[PDB]
Each structure stands twice: as structure tokens, then as C-alpha cells.
Amino acid sequence: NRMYMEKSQTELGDLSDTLLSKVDDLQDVIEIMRKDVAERRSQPAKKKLETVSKDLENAQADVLKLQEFIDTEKPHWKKTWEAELDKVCEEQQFLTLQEELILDLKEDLGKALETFDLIKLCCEE
Amino acid sequence: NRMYMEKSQTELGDLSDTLLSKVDDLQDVIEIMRKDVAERRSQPAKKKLETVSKDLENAQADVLKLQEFIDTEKPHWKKTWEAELDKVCEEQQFLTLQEELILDLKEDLGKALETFDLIKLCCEE
């Protein structure tokens, strides 16, 4: 139901911040080398390479799966939101019919009195 | 709560079906009198002139009373509905931010890949 929904929603934000992190991290460890290679000339170990490569392969896949979650839950959410937007719609459509109806009553009950009164002026004169 | 809402709308309904049955009956009654009076000049029972004349008042009381039922619950309803679109509304802007984020990750992340790949090639040399 709707409980499931506010669950999946907080999680998305979790995965997405578990990435904004990993990525803001690589953005440094790499700007760090970039500085070291562009001026210093100190080449990083062949470890530093092999490891920051796995590091980028992780991230890269960590997106691919973040992009699953979205493409998979977006449906159900979009539908759940739709159902809800519908109930409010019909519930208000009701209060609208109802507001009209009470006018057709005020109308009809009038034309009644008007007519009941005319009869009365007939029924004595 | 939706129970609040599903019931105090069932109630409004019942209240006016009732009032509609009453107005319809009054109408039928008064019509018959009209026929007699008009077509035959056969006056209506002088008691009915008394029972009907009261019933147009119960009915006019019943309108007032119905109309009050609307005027009092309508506000709770608005508040109930608006609390609802706001929820759904937010939950959607959220979704939308996560979408625009996995965009700036895919981007931020690809520019690091582009750049690491350039360094990894300044050490190949």
C-alpha cells in the first residue's frame, strides 16, 4: 500500500547518497593524481591504478543499479499516486453533485410552495 | 483518515436522498390538487390544506438542516484533501530531484572516467 511507498522513497535517497559520496570521493582521489602528474611528475603506483579502476567500475555499476530501482519503482509509485489523485477527484466530484442537488431541491420546493399558494387563493375565493 | 471521509459523505448522501424523497412526495401530492382544482373545480379536503402546509415546513426545515451539514463538513473535507495533495505533491518533487541527481552523477562520474583514463595514459608512457 502507501506504507511500502514512503519506504522505497527513503531508500532511493539512501542509495543515491551512498553514491553522491563514492563519487565525490573519486572526484578527489583523481584530482589529487591529476595534480601529482600534471606538475609533480610523481606517477602513482601500479596499485593505486588497479585499485582506483575497480573503484570506478564499482561506481559505474552502482549507477546501473540505482537506475534499476528507479525504472522499477517509478511504475508502482506513479500508479499509486494516480489512484490517490483519483479518490480525491471523485470525493470532490461528489461534494459537487451534492452542492448542485441541494439547489435543485431549493428550486423544486419553491415551485411547490408557489403552486400550493395559488391553489389556496383558489380554494376560498 | 479515509473512514472519516467515506462515512460523512455517505451521510450527506443519505440526508438528501431523504430530503429528495420528501420533496418528490410533496410535489406529487400538490400536483393532484392542481388537477382537481383546475380541471373539475373539485376542491381538496380542507384537512390536506393543513397537512401539506406543514410538510412544506418540515421540508424547509430539512433543507436548512441539510445545508448546514454541508457547510460544517466541507471545511474538514478541504483540509483533509489538501493534506493529501500536498503529500502526493511532495513525494513527486522528491522523485523528480532523484532523477536530476542520477543525471549529475552519471555526468560528474563520466568526467572523472574521462580524466583518469587520460592519466592512466600518461603513465603508460
Task: Write structural notes for this entry.
Two copies of one chain form a homodimer. Chain A has 125 residues and is mostly helical. Chain A has a single domain (1-125), classed as Methane Monooxygenase Hydroxylase, Chain G, domain 1, CATH 1.20.58. Helices cover 93% and strands 0% of the residues of chain A. Chain A contains two helices and no strands. Chain A has helices at 2-40, 46-122. At the A-B interface, α1 and α2 of A face α1 and α2 of B.
Q: What is the count of helical runs of chain A?
A: 2
Structural class of chain A: mainly alpha
What is the CATH architecture assignment of chain A? Up-down Bundle
Share of helix among residues of chain A?
over 70%
Computed over alpha carbons, the radius of gyration of chain A is: 35 Å
Which strand-content bin applies to the residues of chain A?
under 5%
CATH topology grouping of chain A: Methane Monooxygenase Hydroxylase, Chain G, domain 1
What would the principal axes of the Cα set say about the shape of chain A?
rod-shaped
PDB class: protein binding
Keywords: coiled-coil, protein binding
Assembly: dimeric
Entry title: Crystal structure of a domain of a protein involved in formation of actin cytoskeleton
